[PDB]
Amino acid sequence: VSFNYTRFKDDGSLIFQGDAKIWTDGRLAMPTDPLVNRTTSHALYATPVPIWDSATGNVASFITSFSFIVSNVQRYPPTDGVVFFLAPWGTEIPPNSQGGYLGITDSSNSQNQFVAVEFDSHPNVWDPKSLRSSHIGIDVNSIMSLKAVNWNRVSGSLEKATIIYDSDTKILTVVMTHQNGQITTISQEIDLKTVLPEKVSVGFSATTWNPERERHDIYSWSFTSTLKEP
Amino acid sequence: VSFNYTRFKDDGSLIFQGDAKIWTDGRLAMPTDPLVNRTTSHALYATPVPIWDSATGNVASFITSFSFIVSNVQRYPPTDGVVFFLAPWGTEIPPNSQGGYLGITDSSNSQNQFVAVEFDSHPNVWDPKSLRSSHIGIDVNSIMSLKAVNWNRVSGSLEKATIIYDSDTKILTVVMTHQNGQITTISQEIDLKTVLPEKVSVGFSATTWNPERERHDIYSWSFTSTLKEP
Amino acid sequence: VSFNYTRFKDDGSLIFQGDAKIWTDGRLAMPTDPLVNRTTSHALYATPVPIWDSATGNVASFITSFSFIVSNVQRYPPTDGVVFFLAPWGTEIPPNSQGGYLGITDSSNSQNQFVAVEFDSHPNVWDPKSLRSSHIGIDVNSIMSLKAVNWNRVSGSLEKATIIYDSDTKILTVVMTHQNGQITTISQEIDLKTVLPEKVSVGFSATTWNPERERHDIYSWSFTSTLKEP
Amino acid sequence: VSFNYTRFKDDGSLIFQGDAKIWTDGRLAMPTDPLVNRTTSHALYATPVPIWDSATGNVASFITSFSFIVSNVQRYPPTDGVVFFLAPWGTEIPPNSQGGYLGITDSSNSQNQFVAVEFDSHPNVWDPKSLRSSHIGIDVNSIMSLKAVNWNRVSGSLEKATIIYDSDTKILTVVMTHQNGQITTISQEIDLKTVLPEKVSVGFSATTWNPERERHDIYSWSFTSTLKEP
Numbered sequence: 001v002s003f004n005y006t007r008f009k010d011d012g013s014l015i016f017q018g019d020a021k022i023w024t025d026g027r028l029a030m031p032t033d034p035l036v037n038r039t040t041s042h043a044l045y046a047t048p049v050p051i052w053d054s055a056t057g058n059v060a061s062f063i064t065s066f067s068f069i070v071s072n073v074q075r076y077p078p079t080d081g082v083v084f085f086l087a088p089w090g091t092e093i094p095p096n097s098q099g100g101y102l103g104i105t106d107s108s109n110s111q112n113q114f115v116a117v118e119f120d121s122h123p124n125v126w127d128p129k130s131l132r133s134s135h136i137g138i139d140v141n142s143i144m145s146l147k148a149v150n151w152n153r154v155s156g157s158l159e160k161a162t163i164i165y166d167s168d169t170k171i172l173t174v175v176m177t178h179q180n181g182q183i184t185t186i187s188q189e190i191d192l193k194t195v196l197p198e199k200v201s202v203g204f205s206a207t208t209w210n211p212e213r214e215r216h217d218i219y220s221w222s223f224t225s226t227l228k229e230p
Numbered sequence: 231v232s233f234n235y236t237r238f239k240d241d242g243s244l245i246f247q248g249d250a251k252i253w254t255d256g257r258l259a260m261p262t263d264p265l266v267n268r269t270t271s272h273a274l275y276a277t278p279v280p281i282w283d284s285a286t287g288n289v290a291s292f293i294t295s296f297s298f299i300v301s302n303v304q305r306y307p308p309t310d311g312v313v314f315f316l317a318p319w320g321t322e323i324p325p326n327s328q329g330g331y332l333g334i335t336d337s338s339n340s341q342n343q344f345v346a347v348e349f350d351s352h353p354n355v356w357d358p359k360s361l362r363s364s365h366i367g368i369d370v371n372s373i374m375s376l377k378a379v380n381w382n383r384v385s386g387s388l389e390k391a392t393i394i395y396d397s398d399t400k401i402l403t404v405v406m407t408h409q410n411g412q413i414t415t416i417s418q419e420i421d422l423k424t425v426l427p428e429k430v431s432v433g434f435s436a437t438t439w440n441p442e443r444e445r446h447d448i449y450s451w452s453f454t455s456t457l458k459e460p
Numbered sequence: 461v462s463f464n465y466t467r468f469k470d471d472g473s474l475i476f477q478g479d480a481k482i483w484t485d486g487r488l489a490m491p492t493d494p495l496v497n498r499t500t501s502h503a504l505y506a507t508p509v510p511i512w513d514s515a516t517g518n519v520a521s522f523i524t525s526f527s528f529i530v531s532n533v534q535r536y537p538p539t540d541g542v543v544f545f546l547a548p549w550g551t552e553i554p555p556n557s558q559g560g561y562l563g564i565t566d567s568s569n570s571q572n573q574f575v576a577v578e579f580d581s582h583p584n585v586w587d588p589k590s591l592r593s594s595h596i597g598i599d600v601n602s603i604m605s606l607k608a609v610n611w612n613r614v615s616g617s618l619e620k621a622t623i624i625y626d627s628d629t630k631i632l633t634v635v636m637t638h639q640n641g642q643i644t645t646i647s648q649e650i651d652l653k654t655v656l657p658e659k660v661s662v663g664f665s666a667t668t669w670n671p672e673r674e675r676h677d678i679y680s681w682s683f684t685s686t687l688k689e690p
Numbered sequence: 691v692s693f694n695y696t697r698f699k700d701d702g703s704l705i706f707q708g709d710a711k712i713w714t715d716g717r718l719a720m721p722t723d724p725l726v727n728r729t730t731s732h733a734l735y736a737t738p739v740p741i742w743d744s745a746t747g748n749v750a751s752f753i754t755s756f757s758f759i760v761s762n763v764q765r766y767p768p769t770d771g772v773v774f775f776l777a778p779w780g781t782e783i784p785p786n787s788q789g790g791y792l793g794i795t796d797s798s799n800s801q802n803q804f805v806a807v808e809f810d811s812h813p814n815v816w817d818p819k820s821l822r823s824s825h826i827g828i829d830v831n832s833i834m835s836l837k838a839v840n841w842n843r844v845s846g847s848l849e850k851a852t853i854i855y856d857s858d859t860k861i862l863t864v865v866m867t868h869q870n871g872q873i874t875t876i877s878q879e880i881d882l883k884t885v886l887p888e889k890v891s892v893g894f895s896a897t898t899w900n901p902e903r904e905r906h907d908i909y910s911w912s913f914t915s916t917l918k919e920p
């Protein structure tokens with residue numbers, strides 16, 4: 001699967017759910033209006049990405065990169081915020097997934113499937129119980145990230161995320177290039193065959209809360225996956 | 231922390247919860263009596279194990295070995311498994327953790343936080359949809375193993391586990407030497423410091439169901455952890 | 461360290477050694493002229509890169525991206541490849557590094573010290589005796605790759621490489637997105653602080669042989685690294 | 691391949707090269723006579739170990755333990771080390787492999803093919819630039835350890851090593867339990883299939899120098915490998 005949005009236009013290639021909307025300048029707004037309380041937005045590439053193949057046991061490798069900005073509104077504290085994720089094709093927004101559950105986790109499940117790279121702007125009770133405030137986490141089947149690094153969340157600042165999944169070694173690795181010329185990285189060993197079905201969606205889920213809220217605006221997104229085949 | 235049980239005595243050094251009992255000949259029985267119905271058994275080292283140190287940021291390495299056997303009773307089908315696990319101190323047998331949730335996962339949560347190596351004798355819907363029947367799995371925060379290998383579960387047969395956590399690369403590795411002299415291995419990169427508090431319990435959880443059950447008898451357990459205070 | 465060459469200017473930001481030169485249309489040619497016969501070319505970022513810090517024991521994370529094309533000349537078979545590499549600052553083109561040694565390995569040593577991602581166009585004796593012909597490899601201290609993946613080398617075809625080093629888990633991961641919309645990835649655990657000194661060059665090395673040769677023309681290159689000071 | 695030496699007898703099960711001999715009480719002495727200057731000793735299991743299989747592409751897993759003591763020679767500084775290593779079946783002590791090269795590396799090459807866990811008693815210039823004196827390293831195709839931890843080398847003190855190779859994740863993990871009951875660990879991702887042929891030796895190499903020397907006495911050694919032939 002190969003795609004490249006250098007901007008977003010309604011062209012039938014994406015699937016919006018909840019409060020995700022294409023605002024002009026070709027911005028993917030998640031949510032379109034953060035003043036609405038407790039938004040949940042999904043923005044999925046419109047066809048399934050094969051990530052593994054039953055006949056071969058082969059797993060896909062992929063890279064995706066996206067540039068985005070999270071932004072305060074106006075004196076509200078920021079939440080919740082925005083993820084890139086793989087979920088079973090057929091999954092809708094889960095129940096009991098609002099706010100700090102990022103539109104990807106119910107909350108009560110268990111049970112609960114999903115690989116995510118989260119850009120978490122709000123410290124919940126389960127969050128890197130560090131004094132991390134904002135953080136970049138990798139989630140596997142849990143809102144409690146299996147790894148996470150501090151994120152100097154800067155309102156309106158361009159963040160450039162690159163995520164590589166290497167099927168050979170089963171590593172998901174993330175790098176986020178900040179406007180200040182620094183990078184943050186975090187990685188996690190995940191075998192996609194162990195935790196997800198052979199076809200998933202890829203794309204974003206973003207939430208906000210009330211009074212807590214922020215913009216999650218995605219400016220570009222490229223994605224390349226390859227499943228061998230045999 | 232360093233201990234070595236060549237057999238088990240009820241000497242205050244372990245905490246037994248639920249159906250865990252010392253049974254004949256210093257065998258740690260989990261459960262003592264599988265005829266009972268659905269059993270959940272915890273046997274934990276009775277002192278919290280320091281796995282990382284907040285001051286220095288150092289993380290413990292460890293090596294642990296245990297030998298055990300799982301046995302059929304009677305003509306019942308086998309379930310559910312026995313796991314070695316680390317969890318935050320204050321860990322109690324969670325609610326909703328019967329059967330396939332192996333006494334460590336609250337099926338109606340979401341907030342499950344533990345690291346386990348599972349010896350899982352019954353394929354649940356969330357189990358490796360490889361065709362694995364029995365399997366050895368590594369779990370973090372989820373009953374869906376991040377990695378797993380299959381297990382030739384042989385009733386009555388001695389299994390010899392060795393698990394190495396290497397804090398330098400943050401890999402948990404498991405080898406199982408089977409009665410036939412073969413070994414099974416599985417590993418997972420896990421940053422202990424990111425998924426668990428400074429002090430954890432180490433020990434075992436095992437469940438049985440109804441009608442599915444089996445014995446899980448632990449014969450020996452040694453553990454060495456070293457945490458750099460510089 | 462942060463830089464981003466959308467093309468290459470003769471601007472003192474790089475060090476060129478051997479046959480490396482800025483060539484037509486702002487491209488980095490390695491070598492500038494393959495017709496010559498055997499070439500070795502180095503093009504290094506001209507400032508040492510700090511990749512670990514003595515006081516904290518911290519290791520740098522980085523992400524680097526570069527677009528490049530390798531091209532046949534015109535009937536010769538291709539050799540030898542181009543690499544992205546880290547080497548001890550003060551690196552010169554090593555003795556005995558011609559041809560398949562990629563300008564990074566002194567073949568009569570032993571003391572070779574470097575981390576490289578190679579795009580190797582020619583199967584030498586030590587190359588994946590898979591039947592791989594061209595391959596993308598991760599090299600540490602040796603010309604024999606620790607991990608390699610097969611590479612559909614297409615003459616004149618644009619390749620877009622991304623390499624992420626995550627200091628958290630110590631994993632170097634490569635993605636190369638090919639013109640056909642496929643990607644190849646390869647990944648390797650590498651502790652930069654075990655294998656390299658605290659200041660390194662980043663850059664490229666490329667060689668051609670006689671008769672075997674090809675162009676390696678790099679079009680763009682961005683690099684962001686972050687080393688923590690506390 | 692499975693074996694277990696609780697002591698070493700002259701039973702033709704191993705292959706001894708250079709100064710490896712069975713010494714008093716079935717100790718494997720490497721060198722037998724540390725008064726000799728610049729000793730090299732190999733002690734290999736005398737049957738190849740299949741570590742991977744061409745037809746299926748599967749890699750073996752293995753677990754191995756051995757206990758050994760390194761001991762000073764009075765008035766002499768200690769060198770150089772003892773290593774557990776895998777090398778192509780048919781491997782011979784390399785030329786130019788004395789002293790710091792541990793009988794595994796030809797210091798004038800290239801091209802050295804092996805995987806080793808070294809117990810290195812003599813800090814060479816290429817040794818971990820940590821301040822380590824003695825250290826336990828993982829070596830792939832280089833004398834310069836891909837990873838290392840430091841070793842509190844104590845003359846005459848029992849060391850208990852456990853090494854697991856997990857073919858699933860491709861990770862070599864070492865634990866070493868010291869006489870004081872602390873453990874040291876170190877791991878490295880190495881896909882044996884990328885670096886070694888199908889059949890390998892497993893065993894030990896040890897060197898001394900002049901005037902530096904020490905005994906490397908091995909007391910016990912067990913090994914279990916399993917290679918999936920489907």
Ligand SMILES: *[C@@H]1O[C@H](CO)[C@@H](O)[C@H](O)[C@H]1NC(C)=O
Pocket residue numbers: 177464465466525682
């Ligand atoms: C390099 O610069 C170009 C143009 O200024 C821009 O599109 C891009 O953000 C930069 N590349 C990276 C990866 O930082």
Ligand SMILES: [Ca+2]
Pocket residue numbers: 080100120121122123124127
């Ligand atoms: Ca949160």
Ligand SMILES: [Ca+2]
Pocket residue numbers: 310311330350351352353354357
């Ligand atoms: Ca199960």
Ligand SMILES: [Ca+2]
Pocket residue numbers: 540541560580581582583584587
């Ligand atoms: Ca080559």
Ligand SMILES: [Ca+2]
Pocket residue numbers: 770771790810811812813814817
């Ligand atoms: Ca040395």
Ligand SMILES: [Mn+2]
Pocket residue numbers: 118120127128135137143145
């Ligand atoms: Mn979070």
Ligand SMILES: [Mn+2]
Pocket residue numbers: 348350357358365367373375
């Ligand atoms: Mn399971």
Ligand SMILES: [Mn+2]
Pocket residue numbers: 578580586587588595597603605
């Ligand atoms: Mn190569």
Ligand SMILES: [Mn+2]
Pocket residue numbers: 808810817818825827833835
């Ligand atoms: Mn060394």
